[PDB]
Amino acid sequence: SSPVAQKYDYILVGGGTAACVLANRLSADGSKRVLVLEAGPDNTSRDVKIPAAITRLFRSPLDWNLFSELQEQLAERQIYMARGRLLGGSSATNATLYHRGAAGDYDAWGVEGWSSEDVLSWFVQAETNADFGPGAYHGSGGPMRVENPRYTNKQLHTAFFKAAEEVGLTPNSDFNDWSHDHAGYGTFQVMQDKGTRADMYRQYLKPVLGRRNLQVLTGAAVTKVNIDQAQALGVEFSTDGPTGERLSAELAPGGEVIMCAGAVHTPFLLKHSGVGPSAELKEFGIPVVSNLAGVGQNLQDQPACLTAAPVKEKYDGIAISDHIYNEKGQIRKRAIASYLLGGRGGLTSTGCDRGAFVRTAGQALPDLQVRFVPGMALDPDGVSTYVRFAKFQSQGLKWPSGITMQLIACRPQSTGSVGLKSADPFAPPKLSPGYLTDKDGADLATLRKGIHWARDVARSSALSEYLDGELFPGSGVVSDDQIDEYIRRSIHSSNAITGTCKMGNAGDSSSVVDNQLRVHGVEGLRVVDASVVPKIPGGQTGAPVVMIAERAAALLTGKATIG
Ligand SMILES: Cc1cc2nc3c(=O)[nH]c(=O)nc-3n(C[C@H](O)[C@H](O)[C@H](O)COP(=O)(O)OP(=O)(O)OC[C@H]3O[C@@H](n4cnc5c(N)ncnc54)[C@H](O)[C@@H]3O)c2cc1C
Ligand SMILES: CCCCCCCCCCCCCCCCCC(=O)O
């Protein structure tokens, strides 16, 4: 009753990160009617705009609240996997860190037309950077806003860089400069606009919300993709939810459906639509249109553990939690003033924007990413500590001053999978991260060596001046076996998730889309989101998604070609 006798040249399944990019570029003429279905609500929450409010988005109504299956290798735990639920998707709920990884990450893709030389100009075209001048590696006319963090913890951040130098790291002045080595310590740039989150809704969708040929339905949960027998013809959805009407949106001649539901929901909606491994589809009675085995396989996510330690009493009050909460847990008006009046202060921080890439054992590229947080974790699950920090407000307690180092296997070898658990297209998918399952135990070894690394850093002269012992994992965790166990019981997502409908060369019986993002053996069906990533780059994945999305968009409108 919203697409009534209307036909669309492009239907966008999901209004997330890549979705926002595509709607902008494809609607930019006027001949193409574009439809954007988003299951979550509109992007208006003040928790979304303030970076420090990321603490409130986890396990909120703006999150899918996805929980993984039992992981037997993780002490029989279910792993919470944050995913954004609103216009702009995860770019509106994320830590705002801006990373491209290394050039070799894209060369390792092996896919024709998507080498590092091919992708570079698209990163740059999308970017306006407040702190690097225009060059081969940075842009100034682009829709993204990228800036150095506008919060510095004068004492703890400098101690961290002194400690990294003391144990033998060198600085990296730009982790996204492919002209030098990825490894090193420094400051991560952030996808922010003078301290306001610069998510893809704000940067791409919101400016073009006036075009008459662009229709953006929120509260619109898609259930399947109409594939008449093979050629897609539209989608089915519901504006109320599981207890609503089954609306249908038709496509114009030549109209294409583009999946933008993310690496969790795109392979899931594809399986409900008959695109998947037949054995899995038969088990729920779904007709097989395309029998591609890679739909849902190859899920890559970057697991994390942490160390945490308090400052000496002589340094009580210098952590970021002391810049946000007062001793009774209410937000300090000084922090509120600095944010609103100047875009400065603790409120501009997602907390984990300084760090390092380290090779734990002479790998071709760093296997370890370090995120230093000048606040003290109180749960070894770093996501849980963020949730706990939100609910700590006004509770009348003083959050203790300290530091945390989060350790991330950033180029992991373990792969996971996404599947069906019900025939209910509104049921949660069958989600298995598969952390620590690679046959060599390289991911466990990366994280275990990360713990040793962080302890050496904590023991340096520069940090030992500030620190007073260690809370996590603590004095009791001494042997490699104990470290390994501590990791199994605390490991959490650094929140990537890529690879579940991967792209590849013709004759890749393992891939799902071709180097032009069309799914094999279906007409008018393309995937443009984090699913198509064949091998996760080092670092956080939001920026490469935007790059894939800009490049797709230009390909569809004949501005560029691939191969
Ligand atoms: C908590 C968190 C922290 C992160 N931190 C960072 C970081 O610091 N830096 C960074 O670069 N990356 C980060 N990431 C990752 C980055 O945000 C994502 O990798 C990227 O945004 C993925 O883009 P996408 O378009 O593939 O998916 P999304 O942006 O998630 O888009 C998918 C969209 O599809 C919608 N959808 C799903 N199912 C349906 C349906 N049935 N009907 C309609 N709509 C549907 C969803 O609601 C969502 O809006 C973070 C991720 C999260 C979750
Ligand atoms: C932004 C406000 C800072 C709050 C500080 C809380 C104390 C520090 C806990 C650190 C835990 C490790 C970092 C986990 C980061 C999770 C965010 C993400 O992965 O998207």
Author numbering: 77 to 305, 310 to 643
Share the article's original sentences.
The recently published high-resolution (1.8 Å) structure of FAP, determined from cryo-crystallo­graphic synchrotron data combined with UV–Vis absorbance spectra, revealed a bent oxidized FAD in the dark state.
Here, we extend the study of Sorigué et al. by carrying out the refinement of intermediate-state structures against extrapolated structure factors at 20 ps, 900 ps, 300 ns and 2 µs. In order to model the structural changes that had occurred at the different time points, structure-factor extrapolation was carried out using Xtrapol8, which estimates the structure-factor amplitudes F ext that would have been measured for each pump–probe data set if the photo-triggered intermediate were present in the crystals at 100% occupancy (equation 1). The occupancy of intermediate states was determined to be between 25% and 35% for the four time delays.
